[PDB]
Ligand binder design. Structure first.
Ligand SMILES: OC[C@H]1O[C@H](O[C@H]2[C@H](O)[C@@H](O)[C@@H](O)O[C@@H]2CO)[C@H](O)[C@@H](O)[C@@H]1O
Length: 404
């Protein structure tokens, strides 16, 4: 019978890829359908480029793709419209914001699978050791805490110890981190939902200068090459007071044999001042049936399974990844394992989006401009003031003649 082939989630990031292959195999066994899994690269922008090769070829060789929240406007031609396959009641079981994000010109490109928001990981043991009672609320507090704890831990003999790790590599994850820096300084959304390119302002420049200030001081010099896993590995070995990362890192830090099990919490990222907005970049992944699949009915069935209550539950409990079903945030077993899901729900619902709606199919070009100009501040090549001016110009060229 058919072989249903799935591209999604990378075995190079946490346990995601192993778990996803497990779920696909479970569906195959349940339905008596042969299945195969195709591994993806760690970085989302690399995965996009890989999947674009299949799409350009109208290739039937992948039936189902795990797609990033920032992708629907790029990938819509390559997606089977799921709208006719779901009842209105079925669709309403997902967060409306994410169903809306995944709907492009009326086409439901993909079902919501898991959501994501950037958060602050912090070492509770180390805060207590050094006389702090709460995690930092302002970036200045984060810097002051990081300097004090680093001084102490280095004096105590840990030469691997840093104050703060984050994603500073030139790739999409830096766009995520930078949106949080800029938005939390009251510098705006880089490109506003209405199309205004707002980034050339002093608050956005300050945010970027601040982040440069961390490099080689409270964060490793090598942070300019860090993606999610490189940051996580410093953190997870016990060598960082603070980390910016996504929810998946929580379950990994709590696993048996983790050096930091039981020693951390999570909270909203800091902000410049009490009147700035909280910043948490909206992430997450969706499930797309390929427009080029020869087996749309079977592929839709698998996608519905993967996005189901019990599979999302298993993702939450085992991998601490955020459900796209509001009902799971009240499930006793989800909450018992991840109490912070309740505590930070408002952070997740107020997460700030990257400018993928407004940039539509040009988003990847816009983001490449953002991460390259930001990276030039991090590396010291440019000051924030010059970078936000140069970024304004670049985005203006990229989006000239584009309307949403
Ligand atoms: O790097 C930016 C990318 O980060 C997140 O995707 C991670 C995800 O949290 C992990 O659980 C796993 O699936 O790896 C993904 C990276 O391949 C965001 O969800 C995504 O929106 C964002 O672009």
């Amino acid at each position: 019978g058919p072989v249903i082939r799935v591209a999604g989630d990378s075995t190079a990031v946490g346990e995601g890829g192993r778990w996803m292959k497990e779920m696909v195999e479970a569906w195959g066994k349940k339905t008596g359908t042969r299945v195969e899994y195709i591994d993806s690269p760690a970085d989302t922008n690399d995965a996009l480029a890989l999947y674009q090769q299949y799409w350009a070829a109208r290739s039937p060789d992948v039936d189902v793709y795990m797609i990033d929240v920032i992708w629907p406007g790029i990938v819509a031609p390559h997606a089977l419209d799921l709208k006719p396959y779901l009842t209105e009641a079925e669709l309403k079981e997902f967060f409306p914001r994410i169903v809306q994000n995944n709907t492009i010109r009326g086409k439901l490109t993909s079902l919501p699978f898991f959501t994501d928001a950037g958060i602050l990981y912090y070492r509770k043991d180390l805060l207590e050791k050094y006389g702090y009672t709460s995690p930092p609320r302002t970036w200045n507090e984060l810097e002051q805490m990081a300097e004090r704890v680093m001084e102490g831990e280095r004096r105590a003999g840990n030469r691997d110890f840093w104050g703060f790790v984050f994603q500073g590599k030139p790739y999409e994850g830096l766009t995520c981190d930078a949106l949080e820096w800029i938005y939390s300084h009251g510098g705006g959304r880089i490109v506003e939902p209405d199309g205004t390119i707002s980034v050339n302002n002093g608050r956005a420049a300050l945010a970027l200068n601040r982040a440069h200030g961390w490099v080689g001081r409270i964060a490793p010099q090598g942070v300019t090459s860090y993606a999610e896993e490189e940051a996580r590995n410093v953190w997870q070995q016990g060598n960082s007071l603070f980390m910016r990362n996504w929810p998946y890192a929580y379950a990994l830090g709590q696993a048996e044999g983790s050096p930091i099990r039981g020693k951390f919490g999570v909270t909203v990222l800091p902000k410049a001042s009490a009147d700035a907005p909280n910043a948490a970049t909206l992430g997450g992944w969706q499930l797309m049936v390929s427009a080029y699949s020869r087996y749309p009915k079977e592929a839709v069935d698998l996608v519905k399974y993967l996005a189901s209550y019990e599979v999302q539950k298993d993702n939450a409990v085992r991998l601490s990844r955020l459900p796209t079903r509001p009902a799971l945030y009240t499930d006793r077993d989800v909450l018992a394992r991840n109490p912070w899901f309740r505590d930070l729900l408002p952070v997740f619902q107020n997460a700030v989006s990257r400018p993928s709606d407004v940039a539509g199919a040009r988003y990847n070009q816009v983001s490449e401009a953002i991460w390259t100009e930001v990276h030039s501040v991090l590396t010291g090549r440019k000051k924030g003031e010059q970078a936000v001016r140069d970024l304004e110009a670049r985005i203006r060229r990229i989006l000239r003649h584009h309307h949403h």
